Paper text:
RNA ligases of the RTCB-type play an essential role in tRNA splicing, the unfolded protein response and RNA repair. RTCB is the catalytic subunit of the pentameric human tRNA ligase complex.
Co-crystallizing with Mn2+ and the non-hydrolyzable GTP analog GMPCPP allowed us to obtain an RTCB-Archease complex with a well-resolved GMPCPP molecule in the active site of RTCB. Strikingly, three Mn2+ ions were bound in the composite active site formed by RTCB and Archease (left). Our complex structures revealed an additional metal site, named position C, which solely depends on Archease residues for Mn2+ binding. Mn2+(C) is coordinated octahedrally by Archease side chains D51 (a), D178 (e), the terminal carboxyl group of I179 (e), an oxygen (a) of the γ-phosphate moiety of GMPCPP and two water molecules (e). Moreover, H428Nε2, α-phosphorus atom and carbon atom of GMPCPP are nearly in line, i.e., have adopted already the geometry required for the guanylylation reaction. Overall, the structure mimics a pre-activation state in which Archease is already bound but the guanylyl group is not yet transferred to H428 (left). In both complexes the conserved tip of the arrowhead-shaped Archease is reaching directly into the active site of RTCB, thus forming an extensive interface between both proteins with an area of about 2200 Å2.
Numbering used by the authors:
A (entry chain A): 1 to 505
B (entry chain B): 10 to 179
The structure:
Amino acid sequence: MSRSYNDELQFLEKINKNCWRIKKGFVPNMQVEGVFYVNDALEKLMFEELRNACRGGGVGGFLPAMKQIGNVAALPGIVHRSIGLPDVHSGYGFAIGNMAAFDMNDPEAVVSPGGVGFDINCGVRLLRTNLDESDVQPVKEQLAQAMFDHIPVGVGSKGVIPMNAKDLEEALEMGVDWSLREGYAWAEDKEHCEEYGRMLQADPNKVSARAKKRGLPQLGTLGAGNHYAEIQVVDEIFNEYAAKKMGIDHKGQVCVMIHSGSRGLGHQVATDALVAMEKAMKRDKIIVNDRQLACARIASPEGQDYLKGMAAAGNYAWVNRSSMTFLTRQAFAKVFNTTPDDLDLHVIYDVSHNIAKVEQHVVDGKERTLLVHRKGSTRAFPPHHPLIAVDYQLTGQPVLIGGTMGTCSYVLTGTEQGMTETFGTTCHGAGRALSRAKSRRNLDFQDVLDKLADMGIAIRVASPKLVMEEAPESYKNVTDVVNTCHDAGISKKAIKLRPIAVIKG
Amino acid sequence: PAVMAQEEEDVRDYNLTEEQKAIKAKYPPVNRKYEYLDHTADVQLHAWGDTLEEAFEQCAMAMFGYMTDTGTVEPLQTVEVETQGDDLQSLLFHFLDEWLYKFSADEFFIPREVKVLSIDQRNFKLRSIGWGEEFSLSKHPQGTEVKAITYSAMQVYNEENPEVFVIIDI
Ligand SMILES: Nc1nc2c(ncn2[C@@H]2O[C@H](COP(=O)(O)CP(=O)(O)OP(=O)(O)O)[C@@H](O)[C@H]2O)c(=O)[nH]1
Ligand SMILES: [Mn+2]
Ligand SMILES: [Mn+2]
Ligand SMILES: [Mn+2]
């Protein structure tokens, strides 16, 4: 980070109204170029991060997202581009909102666990109800409290449904199939879940004892950070055909958005693989620009062991989100004295954003088998793709975009242009504009709580005096993110939702 | 008296009860030589001390200080953590990871204080201990869960005023 800002700009070129190019040389050994999609408002945030992430000529600082996109473009076996999506911001290896694809028939192609992330298969599930805003407004606080009472949130929380080591071993192999067998999920849930909620190559023998000891008490918990369970109200329908296939009937309909991942089991699986690869990068002679990008050849034993444990961690995350769904259904049933089935509390879709997937794509006119890394970005497959649930074959695959607890959220669908320009990858959220440390300093917790109250949004959080770290101003404008994706043609807007109650850990 | 902090002080406020406040008044405050610095997605721990050993132990205390108010933790038990690495960075990584694991499994131990007894800089081996008790939601306030240690922008300065910078995943 010893270059001047203006010298860094020598490697940056605007491609079109919504896309920037990162030319080779920005960081060492780039095999392809990097790109990031930003409109005017998102462009300023991205370049400010470049200027300010390592401002001083001394110690400290961190790596801005642009540098991370370039570092990922140096990973062996990458094809096309290292791609930042409109919500992109600095992460810890890949940028948050960073996609990279590797040709599995190139023997030098690698898999990077530290780039997939510690929260393996962290994702968003959207539920619908047959309730209206007018049915919830009278009991908003009671429902917010019922959610908080049913869903364990925050550091130290433990699962309420008892689980033993053997149940965990089955959940790692079966994913949502386990929740179905045990009666915590409905058959319709699996049908509207990405991968049908189970990655078949999952091998519990590749998940370490430590991962299993961390995961057991936490299965069925939300976690902390930006994880949430949010009661929402449909605010705008951009695609009536898409809305119809999703079960969205009218503006004013109540939905629930749940965001959580594979918890301590997944965090440990990623850590174990990260450690195993530092121990192995000598043999295969792999150089990286960032130690956090430690990786292995896809066909190596370390790479295969990671991919199998990653899939098992993926199955755990699907089991965890089903548990949140079951507990959310219990809360609604209690507050409205009606069974969950009588409330039409069905899954619209469940899509993940921290995963590596084997996918068929065309590269320069030739169809290839690629290992697609998506860190903080979502698969968004196009209409008529065979690997989409039947109900969404003609709409395109739903994409669930959380904004903030005090703005809005969106549902999008994948497009053919997206399949072509970004390997069917779109954004996963708004992304951050202010660090938690900077939000702690510049914002007051009571001001955030009052603003939410002046907006009529009920809230239950584990650490109330830290809520400024999740303030709406801490995140990018989600509408800028979704509009950039839409104008770029990689995603199509479908639904807009507004929060009315939120629980956070 | 060297000012190592790069930001103005900013204590995180965990919403203490009267009993939590009373447990903290009962014990000698722990000296804090760490701070929470800017990182867009997560947080950067910055810790320092008079020896590399102290910079390490303050980094672990910084990590635990992000999960709860460690001043409310009583020194009822002592736990040992020994680890090794191939260099100072991986030693620091494994040291923080081993302590994170003590908190996340088995006995769910939260230290009020951590002390590094030795860093063997020829083998990159470390001996440390911590005193505290089992983390309990009835006893300790909820901060933020730490998911993992990362190497992102990790810096270990081993000169006259040792200090470390570590980004952790939250
Ligand atoms: N509808 C909501 N969206 C939110 C809320 N809080 C944060 N976010 C959005 O969710 C988006 C996704 O955030 P991330 O998945 O990157 C945060 P997370 O802790 O899950 O990252 P990991 O460490 O990878 O697990 C984020 O950019 C925000 O725009 C919320 O309260 N409600
Ligand atoms: Mn997550
Ligand atoms: Mn997430
Ligand atoms: Mn994180």
